[PDB]
């Protein structure tokens, strides 16, 4: 098992090594559109871009660029849209992508300001009396309600196509206690958060892809998605044993780059997946336990 | 203290983060000579080259290239020559550099074959009846004696300038139990190894620079040198408190790139430096304890 492997790497202390084999093994595809001199101000980080084959295109006539990737997962039967923390100039685009892609949930795995540095624009409203209007993309965003917990918050926002006065409910899952280049507090907190997202009905096939982001849309984002896709497969084959995470990860790094930024985030992914199966494999209590462990109060 | 800081990063789990700040902060200088199409076969790794300003030049008339860097340390008052694991075609050069630079010790922090892959040429003889002759550089290398331990080995080799029949004794310190992208077994084993090198008289100012290498001459090599230079300073100012390792490291990454390859190697460097001072600050027992702990039998 992966539990065997985890037990083994842990003993050898081969996390960094195993992770460089993964880094050396990841795909590399063009990101030509991302580097166009014109799309320069549309990218938060110089070194993190979407592969052209998998980039999401804005149905905008003008420019169709947005640093975002469609991670489509064949076997798992699940797709996620990973993207960077929108910039002051790209929140209109971010919301446009959510509208066009028909997403129902948004998973923000980062905080707007982290260790003195800005990582993401305040792309949604904090108070219901102040909706936002993204003039460029012709959409209105309003806060309908929040549900603040210890380390995370779920918000029900309403997005409207000013152009058609059509309206939609977007669930927002904001994980506030996961540091940049860091790991979640424990498998409990993470697993408790995933499952909240899962129950929201947000990761559901009847909707467009869940949009997952962090500052660059690769570290915490790859980690979030890695753990969830692996649990998916284990179920799809409710014979967990046959799940190779490193391989799941390599399949995922074909759609977007750098999914999983640190060896420890890789080690974490194992802990989280291993713990998870306890539930998938059958254990009921575990879920209820994660909630306690997650100290969501 | 760094012990305070270590205690702090450990609690926050900010090793990867702190290390990227270091990675983002490191210098970048040309490596133009390293990339000359002609010097291609003189480099083990495509991505690890010496900065031109600090590269070591072979007093060879032909080509003067060798992927090696002179880490000169002002305050510490110590210089090390970090280089890659010589290639089949560059052991003549490696020995030439040792001769011209007048080094007395060689610290090999890697094994020739690691996890099924070759990392370094058998650049020295394993048996006394079989000396080596590097025809290109006109030098003869012979094994005079070895001292095999659990995890390391010291060899006394004799190198001769066939050209002048002049001869020299080169102490070779081979650390065999430090994995690629890995850490030494414990602060005990490391500290016990450094100190052996230290006593050999090899790190002594009356000789040319100690040549330290691993496969690329940056990970285990940066770690080895980081820990030693920090202990140097702490002594030079026997007011340990004022030693910033991250800064020592940044000063070191000005002479050669990537010195310290992983967050854990960074965390290790702290443990090792912290432990070390116990001895520098005065504790005698500690040394003798490291020997025991190092299980050098």
């Amino acid at each position: 098992e992966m539990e065997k492997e985890f037990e083994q790497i842990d003993k050898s202390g081969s996390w960094a090594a195993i992770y460089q084999d993964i880094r050396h093994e990841a795909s590399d595809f063009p990101c030509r559109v991302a580097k166009l001199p014109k799309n320069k101000n549309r990218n938060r980080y110089r070194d993190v871009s979407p592969f052209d084959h998998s980039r999401i295109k804005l149905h905008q006539e003008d420019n169709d660029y947005i640093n975002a990737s469609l991670i489509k997962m064949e076997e798992a039967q699940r797709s996620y849209i990973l993207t960077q923390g929108p910039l002051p100039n790209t929140c209109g685009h971010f919301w446009e992508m959510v509208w066009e892609q028909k997403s129902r949930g948004v998973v923000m795995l980062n905080r707007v300001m982290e260790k003195g540095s800005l990582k993401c624009a305040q792309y949604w409203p904090q108070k219901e009396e102040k909706e936002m209007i993204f003039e460029d993309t012709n959409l209105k965003l309003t806060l309908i309600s929040e549900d603040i917990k210890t380390y995370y918050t779920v918000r029900q926002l309403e997005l409207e196509n000013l152009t058609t006065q059509e309206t939609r409910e977007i669930l927002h899952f904001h994980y506030t206690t996961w540091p940049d280049f860091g790991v979640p507090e424990s498998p409990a907190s993470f697993l408790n958060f995933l499952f909240k997202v899962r129950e929201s009905g947000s990761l559901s096939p009847e909707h467009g892809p869940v949009v997952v982001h962090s500052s660059a849309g690769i570290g915490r984002s790859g980690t979030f998605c890695l753990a969830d896709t692996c649990l998916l497969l284990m179920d799809k084959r409710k014979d967990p044993s046959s799940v190779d995470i490193k391989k799941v990860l390599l399949e995922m790094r074909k759609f977007r780059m750098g999914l999983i930024q640190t060896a420890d985030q890789l080690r974490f992914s194992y802990l989280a997946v291993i713990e998870g199966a306890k539930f998938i494999m059958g254990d009921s209590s575990v879920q209820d336990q994660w909630k306690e462990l997650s100290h969501e109060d | 203290e760094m012990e305070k800081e270590f205690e702090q990063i450990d609690k926050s789990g900010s090793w990867a983060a702190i290390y990227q700040d270091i990675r983002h902060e490191a210098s970048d200088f040309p490596c133009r000579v390293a990339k000359l199409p002609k010097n291609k076969n003189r480099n083990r790794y495509r991505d690890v080259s010496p900065f031109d300003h600090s590269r070591i030049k072979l007093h060879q008339e032909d080509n003067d290239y060798i992927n090696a860097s002179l880490i000169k340390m002002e305050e510490a008052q110590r210089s090390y020559i970090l280089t890659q694991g010589p290639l089949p075609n560059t052991c003549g050069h490696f020995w030439e550099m040792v001769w011209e630079q007048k080094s007395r010790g060689v610290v090999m922090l890697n094994r020739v074959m690691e996890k099924g892959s070759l990392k370094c040429a058998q650049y020295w003889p394993q048996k006394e009846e079989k000396e080596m002759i590097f025809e290109d550089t006109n030098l003869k290398l012979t094994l005079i004696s070895e001292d095999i331990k659990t995890y390391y080995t010291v060899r006394q080799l004799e190198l001769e300038n066939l050209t002048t029949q002049e001869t020299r004794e080169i102490l070779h310190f081979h650390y065999t139990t430090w994995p690629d992208f890995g850490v030494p077994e414990s602060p005990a084993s490391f500290l016990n190894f450094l100190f052996k090198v230290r006593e050999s008289g090899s790190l002594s100012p009356e000789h040319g620079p100690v040549v330290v290498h691993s496969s690329a001459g940056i990970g285990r090599s940066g770690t080895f040198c980081l820990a030693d230079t920090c202990l140097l300073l702490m002594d030079k100012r026997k007011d340990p408190s004022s030693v910033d390792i991250k800064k020592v490291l940044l000063e070191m990454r000005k002479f050669r790139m990537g010195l310290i390859q992983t967050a854990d190697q960074l965390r290790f460097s702290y443990l090792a430096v912290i432990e070390g001072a116990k001895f520098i600050m005065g504790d005698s027992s500690v040394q003798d304890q490291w020997k025991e702990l190092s299980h050098e039998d």
Partner: peptide, 6 residues
């Protein structure tokens, strides 16, 4: 400098 994440 600023620009990078990796």
């Amino acid at each position: 400098d600023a620009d990078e994440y990796l």
